[PDB]
Design a protein around this ligand. Sequence first.
Ligand SMILES: *C(CCC(=O)O)CC[C@H](*)CCC(=O)O
Ligand SMILES: *C(CCC(=O)O)CC[C@H](*)CCC(=O)O
Ligand SMILES: *C(CCC(=O)O)CC[C@H](*)CCC(=O)O
Ligand SMILES: *[C@H](CCC(=O)O)CC[C@@H](*)CCC(=O)O
Ligand SMILES: *[C@H](CCC(=O)O)CC[C@@H](*)CCC(=O)O
Ligand SMILES: *[C@H](CCC(=O)O)CC[C@@H](*)CCC(=O)O
Ligand SMILES: [Mg+2]
Ligand SMILES: [Mg+2]
Ligand SMILES: [Mg+2]
Ligand SMILES: [Mg+2]
Ligand SMILES: [Mg+2]
Ligand SMILES: [Mg+2]
Lengths: 319, 319, 319, 319, 319, 319
Amino acid sequence: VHRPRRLRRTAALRNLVQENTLTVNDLVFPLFVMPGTNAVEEVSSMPGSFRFTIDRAVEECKELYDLGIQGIDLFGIPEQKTEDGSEAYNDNGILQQAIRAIKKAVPELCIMTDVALDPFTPFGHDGLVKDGIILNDETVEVLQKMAVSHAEAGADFVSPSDMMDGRIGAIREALDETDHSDVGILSYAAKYASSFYGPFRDALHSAPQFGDKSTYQMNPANTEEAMKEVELDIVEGADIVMVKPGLAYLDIVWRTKERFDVPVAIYHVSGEYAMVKAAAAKGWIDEDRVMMESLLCMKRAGADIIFTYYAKEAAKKLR
Amino acid sequence: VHRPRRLRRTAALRNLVQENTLTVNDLVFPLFVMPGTNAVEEVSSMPGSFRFTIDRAVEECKELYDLGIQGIDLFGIPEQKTEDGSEAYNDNGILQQAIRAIKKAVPELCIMTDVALDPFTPFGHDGLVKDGIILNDETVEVLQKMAVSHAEAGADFVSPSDMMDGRIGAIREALDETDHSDVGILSYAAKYASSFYGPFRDALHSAPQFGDKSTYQMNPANTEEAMKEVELDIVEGADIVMVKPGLAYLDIVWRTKERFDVPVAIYHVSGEYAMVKAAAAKGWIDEDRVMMESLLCMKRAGADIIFTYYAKEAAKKLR
Amino acid sequence: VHRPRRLRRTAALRNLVQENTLTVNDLVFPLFVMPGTNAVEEVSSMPGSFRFTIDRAVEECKELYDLGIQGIDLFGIPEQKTEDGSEAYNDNGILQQAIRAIKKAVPELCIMTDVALDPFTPFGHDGLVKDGIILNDETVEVLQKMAVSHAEAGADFVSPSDMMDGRIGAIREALDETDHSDVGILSYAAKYASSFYGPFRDALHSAPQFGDKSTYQMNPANTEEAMKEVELDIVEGADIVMVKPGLAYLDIVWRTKERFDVPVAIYHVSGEYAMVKAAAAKGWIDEDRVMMESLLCMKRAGADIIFTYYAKEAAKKLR
Amino acid sequence: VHRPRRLRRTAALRNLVQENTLTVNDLVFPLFVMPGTNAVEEVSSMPGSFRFTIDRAVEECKELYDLGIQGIDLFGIPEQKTEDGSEAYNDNGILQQAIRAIKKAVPELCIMTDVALDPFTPFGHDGLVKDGIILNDETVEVLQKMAVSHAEAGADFVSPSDMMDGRIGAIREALDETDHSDVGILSYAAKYASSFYGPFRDALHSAPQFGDKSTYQMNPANTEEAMKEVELDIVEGADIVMVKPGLAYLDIVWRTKERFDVPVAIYHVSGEYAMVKAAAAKGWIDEDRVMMESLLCMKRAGADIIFTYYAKEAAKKLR
Amino acid sequence: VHRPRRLRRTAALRNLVQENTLTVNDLVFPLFVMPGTNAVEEVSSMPGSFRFTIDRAVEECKELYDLGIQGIDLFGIPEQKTEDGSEAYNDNGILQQAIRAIKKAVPELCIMTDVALDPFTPFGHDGLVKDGIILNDETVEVLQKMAVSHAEAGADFVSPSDMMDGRIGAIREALDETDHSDVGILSYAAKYASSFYGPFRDALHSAPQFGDKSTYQMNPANTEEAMKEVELDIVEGADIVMVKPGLAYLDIVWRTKERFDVPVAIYHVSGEYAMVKAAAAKGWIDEDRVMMESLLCMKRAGADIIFTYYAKEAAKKLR
Amino acid sequence: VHRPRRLRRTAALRNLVQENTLTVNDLVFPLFVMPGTNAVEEVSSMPGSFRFTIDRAVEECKELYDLGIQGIDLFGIPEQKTEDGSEAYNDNGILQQAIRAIKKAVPELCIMTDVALDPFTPFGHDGLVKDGIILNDETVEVLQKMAVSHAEAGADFVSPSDMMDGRIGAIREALDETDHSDVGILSYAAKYASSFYGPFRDALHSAPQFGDKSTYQMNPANTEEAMKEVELDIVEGADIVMVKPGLAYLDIVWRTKERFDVPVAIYHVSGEYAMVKAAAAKGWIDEDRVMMESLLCMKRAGADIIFTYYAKEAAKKLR
Ligand SMILES: *C(CCC(=O)O)CC[C@H](*)CCC(=O)O
Ligand SMILES: *C(CCC(=O)O)CC[C@H](*)CCC(=O)O
Ligand SMILES: *C(CCC(=O)O)CC[C@H](*)CCC(=O)O
Ligand SMILES: *[C@H](CCC(=O)O)CC[C@@H](*)CCC(=O)O
Ligand SMILES: *[C@H](CCC(=O)O)CC[C@@H](*)CCC(=O)O
Ligand SMILES: *[C@H](CCC(=O)O)CC[C@@H](*)CCC(=O)O
Ligand SMILES: [Mg+2]
Ligand SMILES: [Mg+2]
Ligand SMILES: [Mg+2]
Ligand SMILES: [Mg+2]
Ligand SMILES: [Mg+2]
Ligand SMILES: [Mg+2]
């Protein structure tokens, strides 16, 4: 009686019933900005990924937008790393310059900016360290000024990847106070303590991360705790809530979409990206096929936004 | 605290968070075929719609598929109308000739065929009439042969618009018996007794429709009864289920999608089409914008397939 | 075994099981009030619709109530349009006079009043414009005084169609402060950026609307975002929540009714009205049948109140 | 913040927000028919209710339909009572004569017929008795013939009040076999062992009811068991399901409507009717107001059809 | 296969599976206290009901508790009725004396006290009347002092039957402020504007109730609005929430129990009581059977507490 | 108020609250068997994976079970490939020899056997090919015999990976007929048309896979269709249901577990395995940590059984 294969008999039927499709409007391109002029350094552990000087990020953002990419996520690599991480909220900071430069050149592009102290401190942590303890409230107060700093330079969205308690609310208070109630917050609501973050940590040159990040980042075994975490951020006022990492976390994505009535974002992490890249170099997989299939998997799971290092290559195929 | 306008501040942000999108793959173009060679009669009450000869129907389907449309829905206008409606299951019938011709020329296109006795009988009803009563089981037995007839001509899908009880299960049985278990059924599961079908009625020249069709077509006031209708049709083995009419019935479309786990189809009826067309001719509305917005509304309501007479125009804009 | 057609066999059975019915108590008549004495101007793009002088609105409200209509929605057309839109909260305003006059003549009628700056400003926007940006908070403070102004003149309900963030709460604070805790608020909770608003914009003579209204009005593709929008307004204290537009938005209506335990209102928009009117002028549809069927569709979708320009014609048929 | 009294401040507002309404189309009038010509005996325990002769029953039905009542429920009082209850399926039985006479005179009225052995047997039970045991399957086999008998006389619906297991499926089978698959079944799905049926019992003169009917009629303490009872009856093929008694059973009515997607019917029992009637005669209550409020309560509980002895009085007021 | 009658075959099986049972712990006895010494007046419209002088209420409360009744609801009939209703919060009031006397004699009994201005004012309303408008906030401030007055005299629970907005919260604030955070509140959360309250209004001799109570008491047609009403009272801090009236409102009771995780109370109103009493006087029903069946109906619907005038007669049978 | 980091402050607290854990009992080791004696060929595209001879397969299973692995999944590589794939049901086939040998040596281990025609046919598809069409019912009839063949050799479970319609029910029928109603079925219920199966394909040497397998394997874009697929398979009688591929499909795994009440299995595909393996060889990721985290992710998604090529390595670490 029931033969499901009827909806798969032809390409002309599979497209009709196809529940989900990937578009360029689902893609956000992360951009690493280092100091200097006219230099582009390839990440050794992320083939195809690059460190960009401000002038080169500007031109990259032209190519990105012309391909139809709507948003970018900016990551800063400072020349000086300090224990108090005060360079994070420097108005003359490399990140701040990048925002200001890109907003001038490509105004129609949405500039999302990372709000974390990870590459701004010698300990390699998202927050301030005292006696081996990564502090909560002391960090958030630094995070407040950082988000203000980004909004000041002209940023559209701030994306705090710190995983501190109640930072989203404080940042909302901080941004509202400084005439930026129109600058949005993409919370990294359920960021897990993953072993998939390798290639990202050498890409930002962040100094030895010391002890692991299990004091604040989620236990990879937990599902219910992600639901608690996301809700707190929505009550705090987050416009968009993200789950990280991506591929092996598509179950959390589904739970967040089915339950919260808020745009869902996902991170196609460096490790996932390096996995596809290394296996294709050996000839064991097809890079193009796996990268696109995995991006469609994220759309099926219920993600609306995908922060991916394959965004530009994905943009070219969806033209 | 909460400012939803943040996700509306720029075209860049609106596109990232946009929950639903319209594609060429959500469109099916209904096609009316009349007897003769090389003639295209425009429908008076549907500007832009045409009665096609088998040879010019082929011409249209080349143009349709090249624009990226995956499926068509065929309607036949027979030279002769009989009380027993036997021409419906004629193997040399115009409908059958059109299927066989289109399938030869453009094989990669999905041919869906209307299974109803409306234009084949002088009484203008979907079934066989006796003493003013439109008969159920006697009709289905004729419909069984009709559906088999289409499959024999080369049809991919059959779309029974009759609204007789238990027709789908019997058609499934009849199709399975004649080695066509790979031919699908798109059921008009919740088809309503609407006054929006005016322009469709004179388009197929169907003879005096007599009294209304409230004895079998659903009461426009009923919601819970659409759920009952759809289920029976799924248990019977429908691959796709349809809600008709479209615009003013998007609540039913949403109920069907949230409850049944089966591809949902919808009909953008001739009345809706003529309504946009007549108001645009006066300059009171923008044709392109209203037609596209109404199509987006249907995707939002949770439809996957849209039977629309604007399909080709919409395809041109999404190209 | 199961033959649903049994409940459709006769008119005497269809009425018994009929899930929903339209009554006069479901209808609200929108009224446009222009300055002057003894003048009634027909809207060129809305046949059957009229611009009313105060003395003529009074007499119209007699005919409306005598037919059994319980509520009216007042729209003002001022002689002077100012960039600050201060005429909106003028106690001697044409809208205010209308409220005061109608309340004297027909006390038993519920006067709902529009709270938006659309026809009161040269830019044709629901709010105040600065550097091309339609302001949020600055607008709401003007909206506060406007609602107070209406309540002062004797209005029963205020219906803010502005689509600003947090206006409903502020208006509730504003009305509570000025001894009007008994004057209700019908929020336009999920008003979409539609291309169906044409004939309404020329009816209020509102000056060229400049750029589109996508910064605040909802994306026609969004369903989940409407659920977020409605809830915020209910927490803010809205007595009634409306979805706009109507016919092609019946899915949102269903979601709002099934989830919020609050009276649901809907807007039968000018474009929908002009569509039925233009097609009937051509003879392609039956005006009476389509207008009533579409009103029943709204009752089926779960609406309690219908703001419709066919209200009086609908009232006459339901007598 | 929240003031619900805002929607109660005026008759104009109460009517707009009113969730449910009572219509003539929700009313079915039960009619008792006795042997003889031209005689109307008033029931002592039901003031306003009458025993009717076939000829005066016709007279009543003209008056009923002209007031707008769509359906009647017929009860027969036979001249002779036999232990095998064979008069129930007599083709010249008074019930059958009444069906055939009413259907000729007022054809546009829906005739529903009681299928029970209560007034046809000396033991006063719904089924056949053996050794003090009211038999199940032996009863249903008699009920099958009874239902067929009514269909043969011209009945539109059969309403089996017996509360035997699996009776509906068998009646459906029996009706389908005898070319009556178009005749519906209104099942007394959750009929309770109530003490409210006093005035109904002497009205049909049913001989000494013996011991109570707790062996088959539901325990007034059971909720979950009504859900079990109703489902079996729907799977068996009931078109409408009924809850009995009415007023004190509105919770069951709500459970049935929220869970089953099938038209729900209810019985306004003789005891409820006599209760209002006796208290009004003392001047302790207002008859008109209580009868109407109780009918509104049933519509609110989610019933669509109401079997009530006040049907004609209610029809007069809704006219 | 499935024969439900198996669980009804014997009394020894019906008791095992019986889902719900009525106990004495489900019963609360309402008590009307008039001024004077050694006098008991029978309510003409409520046979079996009595007006009690303080000394006679004390002795009645002995008989009530000895039968196993845990709670009583006290209603006051003052010698003087004033427009400001200041006698309501008089420490020397007849109600206050009753509380104090009964608490001395039967300490183990739970004294619940009515908090409404109905029999304390000449207009016969639950609140203070100004220009025909029954005031909200002005009433609640009087209600605050009334509840304090009751708690002062030694009351256990206060049961506000006023149906004013936000009274439960204010009374909670008022009781908390005056060292009575341990005195509970049984809110009349969803009290409907019923025509069943007749015999209660003459029992308290309350002066002509003037215009009806539709400005604050619920529309008998509304279900969703009861859900909104109950929640507000639970957020305000109500320990117990009641639905009124009882029998014809068992659907609201079910909705309240299934959704709110809070003890549910119900009122077996005077009109329901007078209905059973009048019909039994005629011999049409069995008083004992109907009274107990209807009390079990309330337990089935999900009520925990039943305010009933048959409580003592019910207590005697459940001994 | 809320600080989730409290449950992350120490390893002592993280372990107490940890929602999910990985055990040796959640692991199944897939085993490839080739013809010959005493030979172990390592897969070029899967480092760590091996082609085993029946005798060395036994050797492996001793080592596997001693580490605590409860189940294995056997794949056969036949010396000869025929178009009818008859070697699949050969009783002296290598697969059958391996079952019979392993079951003798290590009896306490659960032998699960792959039921597919992929490595047995030159066309490289799961079913029989005719005119470019992979046949359904003709395939299942061969699969029936195959499953019976395994049961005859001594298999405990059969795991059909074919993705033909209605194969499970027929296999259940076929197994029950041949006195093997105690042999289970682990259905590949939602197997997707993935590009992750590269390294598995050359491992079993399966001849040119021809065109893709989108005619029967699920579209990676479909969520609702996995729910439809799984249900049919459960109604057919599957004891365990599987989702494939794994990591990028954890949303489907969660949907299946939350809805179906049947043990959920998952496949850690060769592509995922090669991805971790290739990236670790470059030193971009930690092999041990990523492999274990991905396995934990699967347990979190709600899987109970995990088919993984890292099973033995994982078993060593959990020892
Ligand atoms: C139903 C209508 C048949 C009829 O009444 O003629 C099947 C075809 C639907 C077409 C919709 C339209 O374009 O009106
Ligand atoms: C059930 C009652 C039969 C009986 O016990 O006599 C079927 C008829 C219901 C009538 C309800 C009433 O009016 O009491
Ligand atoms: C499905 C894949 C068959 C094929 O396409 O060769 C059944 C076996 C799954 C193995 C998964 C893997 O390791 O790739
Ligand atoms: C979160 C993780 C920081 C770290 O531990 O390196 C902030 C940035 C996420 C992207 C990581 C990736 O691409 O893997
Ligand atoms: C909302 C839309 C304003 C506009 O854009 O014109 C306020 C009034 C709604 C009615 C519009 C209609 O009737 O189409
Ligand atoms: C609510 C109703 C007051 C009234 O209108 O009389 C407070 C007391 C309820 C009991 C009424 C009854 O027993 O009917
Ligand atoms: Mg957090
Ligand atoms: Mg059907
Ligand atoms: Mg809003
Ligand atoms: Mg039954
Ligand atoms: Mg209240
Ligand atoms: Mg399957």
